[PDB]
Structure 1
């Protein structure tokens, strides 16, 4: 009845006050918000990354806001206790408004969100109150206690936690005129911090007090794929999120493993990752170096990390015990997996969401070329073991027929005359397919 029961307010990529007056309310992909106390009250400052479409501004604040959320068209402010929310569009044509949420006993706003169609406010009790852009209420609903919120242009993603139902997420696309649902209270595989919260941590107690669940961010992708980051330091993507039956939770990045393999060999713990957004292998995250997990007021440059599957085995990686060497046998397989998942993700948005930048087809073609190159390398590796059935099985997934001809050449050159006939038979079958 304590600890995780504290539905303390949380905003994406939040920050605790710590030992100073500077606090980061939110770090979306479009900017960050910081608060400083003027010895009696807070002065909010909102900055934007894409300087050229927005202009940063700072205003005096008297209510002491605890929640924030930045969109491409406006930002929303919230309060934990007596949670009077405030919504302020960036453009001056739309006038900002404030509203007072219905607060009950023991109630406290946990997360806030906004969308050009509707604005959504969370509640520790589990309410799902929503309003229009201009503040007029639209509907009031009750669900499992909401702890976090993050919204894309037209879709809203939330994670519900309760002491009885557990961590349940829900991805709902409000839409301009059609509230098409995609998930509702479905279980999620995120690992809540339990062992690490058993009074054994250094400088992490304050951050865990700031966020009981330790979930750092719920940022989307450039193609609408939800992503999760927290204590386990592994991204969680929704590959086939369009179909509820096709739900897929794929760990796409392993922060600790990548940090170790780029650090020279040490299992360094002084490097902490604060993710901001992900866009097609481009994970923007501040890599703070020190004992403090959260960054400081001079927000460092958002260094980019690339996605990598947790296929890296320690036993194979410690071949050269101490530019960490990578096993070439497994490196190509991991590249195959990455190309596979990226192609699958891109195909979902190709026919449905349409072209986004005008180069998705070309990058998909290059990715498919690399996908078949990985298959060719694995085919050669299997042929190196004189396992004809292994190469035959791997050759059935080839996409380009020119790669299949290259596989024929590999079979005819890698001391495998018997593989020649089977790969030629596959090619001849593909003639009619």
Structure 2
């Protein structure tokens, strides 16, 4: 009874407006206008300083798209025609037809500098080199959304007989590895049981707004719950875990002054380290209009905040202790993610050692604010646990000073035991 509608990242419906977007990305965006029952493609870029726009007619009805650094990929969901257009023209464009069994659709497509991928409503995973030579065919749970970066592919599957699930894979030189393999995905579906919502979820019943890799190559997804999930420690599957690193609905509630606004919505583009690049849509329709607002940013913020405290203790002004909690957690998770990136992938931009040091500074400072909060109640055990969570000697001696002005000598002794046990190594 479900309908496997085609999907592309950050794409939009037509609605009742004949101008539509096929995809949006940190690179740029793509749109179509349905002129005379053919489709004038428009390809646009945000860093115009190195990419030219271009415009052409699709006479086939391409309703799938992916946009990457090296090129753009298109697909017509019904017939199985796909097309690749590099952004230079030293390389040729190319077009191919993909087999469709009866009742099948292509559901989604993706591309990278070294791979091209296609997925279908009967779960066929078809992949090619960047020049269109078939390199593998595989059958999976029905692929309903798809994305990729470098050698890495992150796919989302759904059916009445497999449930919502995902896979993460990477091509080695010798063979492909799966890190995660149709594992259940903790994203929320839309409430199937508001007219703008019904329009969008008719266009996209699966409710994914976008799914993408971070700037450091961590999988991310943004669903009907309007929270950004990131898969932490994906490089070690047994201990990998999804982190809801931003509740954008909560942040919109804060920025609007603690107000239950129906009239502001976040559309994601990409996770650049500490910030979600996004388009802040406004008004009745919950997806961007033809004249796009500029690519905005939200800082990611861990969902530890509660409205009942924000309302009474407070454009909303965060209390210092609750702020210290969220700073501690955000510093912790980003520190771990960049440590794993450095161990696994190395420096991708040449400054991540300094970013990680800055995060560790913010981490220990957040813990010091929490330590001061505990010592303000003379909660020795809570304060000493926080002292175990500090990770540099400078911060440990600062904790001793805070304990001393708290007139609390038991902590002074115990934290100096920590210091001795650590600098003796």
Looking at structure 1, the residues matched to 172 and 292 of structure 2 have their Cα atoms a distance apart, in angstroms, of 34
Cα deviation for residue 256 of structure 1 reads 1.1
Q: Do the aligned partners of 1:147 and 1:159 also contact (CA within 8 Å) in 2?
A: yes
Secondary structure (helix, strand or coil) at the match of 1:33 reads strand
Deviates more, 1:145-154 or 1:175-184: 175-184
Q: Do the aligned partners of 1:282 and 1:306 also contact (CA within 8 Å) in 2?
A: yes
Q: Do the aligned partners of 2:313 and 2:319 also contact (CA within 8 Å) in 1?
A: no
Cα deviation for residue 176 of structure 1 reads 5.5
Q: Do the aligned partners of 1:222 and 1:280 also contact (CA within 8 Å) in 2?
A: yes
Q: Do the aligned partners of 2:258 and 2:311 also contact (CA within 8 Å) in 1?
A: no
Could you tell me which of 92, 97, 114 is aligned with 1:95?
Answer: 92
Cα deviation for residue 178 of structure 1 reads 4.4
Cα deviation for residue 175 of structure 1 reads 4.5
Q: Deviations over 1:51-95 (max 9, x none)?
A: 222211111210010001111111111011112111111111111
Looking at structure 1, the residues matched to 115 and 397 of structure 2 have their Cα atoms a distance apart, in angstroms, of 54
Looking at structure 2, the residues matched to 417 and 90 of structure 1 have their Cα atoms a distance apart, in angstroms, of 67
RMSD of Structure 2 on Structure 1 (CA): 1.4
Q: Do the aligned partners of 1:155 and 1:175 also contact (CA within 8 Å) in 2?
A: no
Q: Deviations over 1:24-55 (max 9, x none)?
A: 00112211000012223110011122222221
**Number of residue equivalences:** 425
Q: Deviations over 1:3-43 (max 9, x none)?
A: x6210101000110111111100112211000012223110
Looking at structure 2, the residues matched to 195 and 179 of structure 1 have their Cα atoms a distance apart, in angstroms, of 37
Secondary structure (helix, strand or coil) at the match of 1:65 reads coil
Secondary structure (helix, strand or coil) at the match of 1:94 reads coil
Cα deviation for residue 431 of structure 1 reads 2.1
Cα deviation for residue 291 of structure 1 reads 0.2
Cα deviation for residue 316 of structure 1 reads 1.5
Looking at structure 2, the residues matched to 365 and 141 of structure 1 have their Cα atoms a distance apart, in angstroms, of 43
Deviates more, 1:233-242 or 1:389-398: 389-398
Looking at structure 1, the residues matched to 313 and 367 of structure 2 have their Cα atoms a distance apart, in angstroms, of 26
Distance 1:177 1:302, change over 3 A: farther
Secondary structure (helix, strand or coil) at the match of 2:33 reads strand
Q: Deviations over 1:207-251 (max 9, x none)?
A: 111101110000210001111111100011011010111111010
TM-score (norm 2): 0.97
Could you tell me which of 362, 365, 378 is aligned with 1:386?
Answer: 378
Q: Do the aligned partners of 2:248 and 2:266 also contact (CA within 8 Å) in 1?
A: yes
Cα deviation for residue 116 of structure 1 reads 2.5
Q: Do the aligned partners of 1:154 and 1:176 also contact (CA within 8 Å) in 2?
A: no
Runs of 4+ aligned residues of structure 1 deviating over 6 Å after TM superposition are: none
Q: Deviations over 1:265-303 (max 9, x none)?
A: 211121111100011112111111100011111111111
Q: Do the aligned partners of 1:34 and 1:44 also contact (CA within 8 Å) in 2?
A: yes
Q: Do the aligned partners of 1:149 and 1:159 also contact (CA within 8 Å) in 2?
A: yes
Q: Do the aligned partners of 1:240 and 1:348 also contact (CA within 8 Å) in 2?
A: yes
Q: Do the aligned partners of 1:171 and 1:182 also contact (CA within 8 Å) in 2?
A: yes
Secondary structure (helix, strand or coil) at the match of 1:164 reads coil
Q: Do the aligned partners of 2:71 and 2:84 also contact (CA within 8 Å) in 1?
A: yes
Q: Deviations over 1:84-137 (max 9, x none)?
A: 111111111111111111111111111011122221111111111122222222
Q: Do the aligned partners of 1:174 and 1:180 also contact (CA within 8 Å) in 2?
A: yes
Deviates more, 1:236-245 or 1:50-59: 50-59
Looking at structure 1, the residues matched to 264 and 172 of structure 2 have their Cα atoms a distance apart, in angstroms, of 40
Looking at structure 2, the residues matched to 178 and 351 of structure 1 have their Cα atoms a distance apart, in angstroms, of 22
Looking at structure 1, the residues matched to 358 and 291 of structure 2 have their Cα atoms a distance apart, in angstroms, of 39
Could you tell me which of 358, 379, 385 is aligned with 1:366?
Answer: 358
Secondary structure (helix, strand or coil) at the match of 1:184 reads strand
TM-score (norm 1): 0.95
Deviates more, 1:170-179 or 1:5-14: 170-179
Looking at structure 2, the residues matched to 286 and 343 of structure 1 have their Cα atoms a distance apart, in angstroms, of 27
Cα deviation for residue 139 of structure 1 reads 1.9
Cα deviation for residue 195 of structure 1 reads 5.3
Cα deviation for residue 338 of structure 1 reads 0.3
Q: Do the aligned partners of 1:117 and 1:174 also contact (CA within 8 Å) in 2?
A: no
Q: Do the aligned partners of 2:39 and 2:57 also contact (CA within 8 Å) in 1?
A: yes
Looking at structure 2, the residues matched to 393 and 132 of structure 1 have their Cα atoms a distance apart, in angstroms, of 53
Looking at structure 2, the residues matched to 50 and 365 of structure 1 have their Cα atoms a distance apart, in angstroms, of 29
Q: Which has the higher strand share?
A: 2
